[PDB]
Amino acid sequence: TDSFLLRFLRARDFDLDLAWRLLKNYYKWRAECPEISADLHPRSIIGLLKAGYHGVLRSRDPTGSKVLIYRIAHWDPKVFTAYDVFRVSLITSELIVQEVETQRNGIKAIFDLEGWQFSHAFQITPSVAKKIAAVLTDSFPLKVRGIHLINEPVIFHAVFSMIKPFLTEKIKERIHMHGNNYKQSLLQHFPDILPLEYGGEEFSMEDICQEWTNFIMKSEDYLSSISESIQ
Amino acid sequence: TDSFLLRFLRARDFDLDLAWRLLKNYYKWRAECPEISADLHPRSIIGLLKAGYHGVLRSRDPTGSKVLIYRIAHWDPKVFTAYDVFRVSLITSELIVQEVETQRNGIKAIFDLEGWQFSHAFQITPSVAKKIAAVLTDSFPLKVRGIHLINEPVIFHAVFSMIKPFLTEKIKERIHMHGNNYKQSLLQHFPDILPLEYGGEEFSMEDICQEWTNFIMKSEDYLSSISESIQ
Amino acid sequence: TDSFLLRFLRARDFDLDLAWRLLKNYYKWRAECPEISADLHPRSIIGLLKAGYHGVLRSRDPTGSKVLIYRIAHWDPKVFTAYDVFRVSLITSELIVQEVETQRNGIKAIFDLEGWQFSHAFQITPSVAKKIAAVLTDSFPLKVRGIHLINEPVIFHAVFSMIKPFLTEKIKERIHMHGNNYKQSLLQHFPDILPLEYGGEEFSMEDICQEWTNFIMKSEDYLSSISESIQ
Amino acid sequence: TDSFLLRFLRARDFDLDLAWRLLKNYYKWRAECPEISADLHPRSIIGLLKAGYHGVLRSRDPTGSKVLIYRIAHWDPKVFTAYDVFRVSLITSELIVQEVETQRNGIKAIFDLEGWQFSHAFQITPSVAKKIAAVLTDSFPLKVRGIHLINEPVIFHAVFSMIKPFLTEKIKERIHMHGNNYKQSLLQHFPDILPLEYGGEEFSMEDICQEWTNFIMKSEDYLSSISESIQ
Ligand SMILES: Cc1c(C)c2c(c(C)c1O)CC[C@@](C)(CCC[C@H](C)CCC[C@H](C)CCCC(C)C)O2
Ligand SMILES: Cc1c(C)c2c(c(C)c1O)CC[C@@](C)(CCC[C@H](C)CCC[C@H](C)CCCC(C)C)O2
Ligand SMILES: Cc1c(C)c2c(c(C)c1O)CC[C@@](C)(CCC[C@H](C)CCC[C@H](C)CCCC(C)C)O2
Ligand SMILES: Cc1c(C)c2c(c(C)c1O)CC[C@@](C)(CCC[C@H](C)CCC[C@H](C)CCCC(C)C)O2
Ligand SMILES: [Cl-]
Ligand SMILES: [Cl-]
Ligand SMILES: [Cl-]
Ligand SMILES: [Cl-]
Ligand SMILES: [Cl-]
Ligand SMILES: [Cl-]
Ligand SMILES: [Cl-]
Ligand SMILES: [Cl-]
Numbered sequence A, B, C, D: 001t002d003s004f005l006l007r008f009l010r011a012r013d014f015d016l017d018l019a020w021r022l023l024k025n026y027y028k029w030r031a032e033c034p035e036i037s038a039d040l041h042p043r044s045i046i047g048l049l050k051a052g053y054h055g056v057l058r059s060r061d062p063t064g065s066k067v068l069i070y071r072i073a074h075w076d077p078k079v080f081t082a083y084d085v086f087r088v089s090l091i092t093s094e095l096i097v098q099e100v101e102t103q104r105n106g107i108k109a110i111f112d113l114e115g116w117q118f119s120h121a122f123q124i125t126p127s128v129a130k131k132i133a134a135v136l137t138d139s140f141p142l143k144v145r146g147i148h149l150i151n152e153p154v155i156f157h158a159v160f161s162m163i164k165p166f167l168t169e170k171i172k173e174r175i176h177m178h179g180n181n182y183k184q185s186l187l188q189h190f191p192d193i194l195p196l197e198y199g200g201e202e203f204s205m206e207d208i209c210q211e212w213t214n215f216i217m218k219s220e221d222y223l224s225s226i227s228e229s230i231q
Helices: A005-009 A014-030 A045-052 A082-096 A100-105 A118-123 A124-136 A154-165 A169-173 A183-189 A207-220 A221-229 B006-011 B016-033 B047-052 B082-096 B101-105 B118-123 B125-136 B156-166 B169-171 B183-189 B205-220 B220-227 C006-011 C016-031 C046-050 C082-096 C100-105 C118-123 C127-135 C156-166 C171-174 C183-189 C205-218 C219-226 D004-009 D018-032 D046-050 D082-096 D100-105 D117-123 D124-139 D156-166 D171-175 D184-188 D205-220 D219-225
Strands: A052-055 A066-071 A108-113 A146-150 A175-179 B054-056 B066-070 B106-110 B144-150 B175-179 C053-058 C064-069 C107-112 C145-148 C175-179 D054-056 D064-073 D106-110 D144-150 D174-181
Touching: A005 A014, A005 A100, A014 A124, A014 B016, A045 A082, A045 A207, A045 D174, A052 A082, A052 A207, A066 A082, A066 A207, A066 B047, A082 A124, A082 A207, A082 A221, A118 A154, A124 A146, A124 A154, A124 A169, A146 A183, A146 C100, A154 B082, A175 A183, A207 A221, B006 B101, B016 B125, B047 B082, B047 B205, B054 B082, B054 B205, B066 B082, B066 B205, B082 B125, B082 B205, B082 B220, B082 C053, B118 B156, B125 B144, B125 B156, B144 B183, B169 B175, B175 B183, B205 B220, C006 C016, C006 C100, C046 C082, C046 C205, C053 C082, C053 C205, C064 C082, C064 C205, C082 C205, C082 C219, C118 C156, C118 C175, C118 D018, C127 C145, C127 C156, C127 C171, C171 C175, C175 C183, C175 D184, C205 C219, D004 D018, D004 D100, D018 D124, D046 D082, D046 D205, D054 D082, D054 D205, D064 D082, D064 D205, D082 D124, D082 D205, D082 D219, D124 D144, D124 D156, D124 D171, D144 D184, D171 D174, D174 D219, D205 D219
Parallel strands: A066 A108, A108 A146, A146 A175, B066 B106, B106 B144, B144 B175, C064 C107, C107 C145, C145 C175, D064 D106, D106 D144, D144 D174
Antiparallel strands: A052 A066, B054 B066, C053 C064, D054 D064
């Protein structure tokens, strides 16, 4: 039985001081006003999952990182708030951090920003921006080994400019923007494992999303106990 | 179920600051270049165990300390490196630290240096010397209550002189050198519990080594999980 | 008979202080833990040479620099480690530094990074990165007048980002990245002397590699004496 | 052809600064008033050699150090001065430093002080004492890995007390005093290689001295060229 504090050690290469600072932030970061709740039950965001907003690839990248996929077009800003969408990432992260190999090799996330609207940007306030930067850098026990943005419209750079100043130099080096002709570049970073929609060979995004939705629903009892352990 | 961090508390008389510093070193000490691996499976050093290099007494000393015995003559430096020999002590220590009474009363080690050669000393580099001093003082959650050297040849003092400068005043007070006429002195420190070869009454070293070898092999599954919890 | 210390003078335009600092680093740089051995015998890396990984052009560039060619596709990371590959450059450098005209006009290296894999990047640790930067700047008596990277995949920039912070401003100005359409740009820097595979007119890479392999094997006695003069 | 400055590098583990300081002292140390001459021709001390004062063992110690033997009883202070006796060590040192394996593994010297008289001590002035300490520590490119004194009379400690304050902590750790029952202790440091007179099995001191005397006489042309290269 790995202690709860072991994931923080692995996240900081067993540097006790650094892991301590990470744990401190992990308990404080969401309490930043206006706070996001510690509620991690999928009932409030099951609609997002069924809309096909989010999924996790079955296979890891060539360095062992778990690969996450987000499709912004499947987020209706009139139905779900940024906090709801944020909650989806929290739920997923709390689940995949259980894997030791994820703890060691980190994660990489792919954001399909095709269909990004001003209504989306309206949700991203400075306070939200700060929280995004927090979990990317030093507030959650997951190594962010790479962030890949594809199909980014020109209007998105305003949003990213809100997040940028709160980002460390390390994470900034790991943020990639591919544009519309992403497939060649994206395939080089993720051989053999991408879905059909992004240059892959086997699985479709619909299947990948449905699989991860089932896993989240399946884990709703574990997600409840996590919620009660941070309040 | 005692938490993993309780053995560090007991090792420092429940001084939270001091136990914290010990845990920090416990995760860092082996990473000192050139590093020793976190691998604790007995497969790589089963030869040493079967050669009769190492054993643990069945009974404790009058103060409750576990008593460890090392015979340097049973270490062939042409077959096993200093790192392999070091690994044997790591494996044994990770096992006996599970006993609460060992956590409270510490350990005492007896090194039979009869048969110490220059080929042995060749293995003990300055880096190795530093690591020896580290686990003796502040890098492993075991109180070193005594170190007893017997049958030490005159050429050994060069080796000890490498270790000495990195030793604290407390541990230095606890290092004894008996020479060839050790039996009278050694019996006073360890009544009733020594093997036949060292003035004892009952058990032989061959039996003691065979018993501890079986226990190590028996614990190979626990030793694997420890290895995976420090990387 | 040119003294051994003359190549360090020529490398620093007969600035005695600067040449002294270079000689100091030349003796210390490989001892950085984890150290690379001073062994320069081609027996350990003959496989790399026969695989066509490395060769030296017969003719010099328009400024008199010796031109070196490396093909990363001919390096199998499952057979040869980064240290083995590093050793190949050490061996070549120790040979060409014997030429006075190379001492005066320096060298230029061309790295064909076509076929660069994550398995290659796995070998390039931070410690290795530091050593690469060391021999590029101030640890070997060869003026690096230019480094040319061709056919670089997008995933390589992560590796280069490890090396970059340890690079001086001078050397950084001398690192070129051409991409896939390199031929026009590469021909302007190296007229008349390139192999067929890179826009040249006469010789093939296979011939160039075979010629330099023979020369290395031919010089194995000189390479042994160098090894014994740095330990 | 190893440069003359390579022996200073090997003597200081290729630390360029430290080797530089050693070379500086090597040229200055004998010039300390009252100076000893740079003359290294055996003609002035052939009498000492034929008297059986000095010899070098054919075999090295278990660590590769050259082993030197001095017999103070064969020094007649009424015939040869301390400077003459000092010259013998200079001559021997300049010869054995030519061996690369001696440069790497250093030397160990055995002084048989049986027959030490006050007439001997009369020769050892404070200035002489300082010079003895100089060549032991930082004025000659030979690592002193050990000094062994045997058969030392009680009156010798006055002489050693003159040398002691000018000795570094490192060298002081390497000075052994065995007394009259030296054989057991001396054999442990030098197995298989000692002469008959000191617990050995094969060769006698008379043979060892005669062999080294021939070698010195044989090298008189090399010793002349060394003398002319330090003035
Ligand atoms: C532990 C962890 C969390 C919790 C996490 C992410 C990652 C990589 C993590 O490791 C990435 C996404 C994020 C920050 C949730 C983002 C919430 C907003 C609403 C997403 C849509 C708008 C973003 C402007 C789109 C770009 C996001 C990238 C700049 C990361 O939640
Ligand atoms: C937690 C712990 C470890 C890990 C440990 C020891 C003790 C008492 C511990 O509590 C004692 C032995 C040691 C340091 C391994 C020593 C490895 C070398 C190769 C032993 C042979 C050579 C030594 C020069 C012999 C003398 C050793 C004493 C000076 C300790 O490993
Ligand atoms: C004196 C000298 C040495 C010794 C040398 C080089 C040069 C130009 C020298 O002048 C260039 C190559 C290098 C640094 C060996 C590199 C070893 C690694 C394994 C090469 C493959 C991976 C590299 C990441 C590829 C890019 C290299 C460039 C950034 C230089 O060895
Ligand atoms: C490079 C080198 C030299 C040059 C050298 C020695 C050694 C080990 C060297 O490595 C040892 C002997 C010495 C210092 C010459 C000594 C001269 C006197 C006259 C010897 C007789 C009286 C001594 C009081 C006897 C004890 C000597 C030990 C304390 C070294 O010359
Ligand atoms: Cl909320
Ligand atoms: Cl990219
Ligand atoms: Cl190892
Ligand atoms: Cl005692
Ligand atoms: Cl190596
Ligand atoms: Cl260019
Ligand atoms: Cl004189
Ligand atoms: Cl002794």
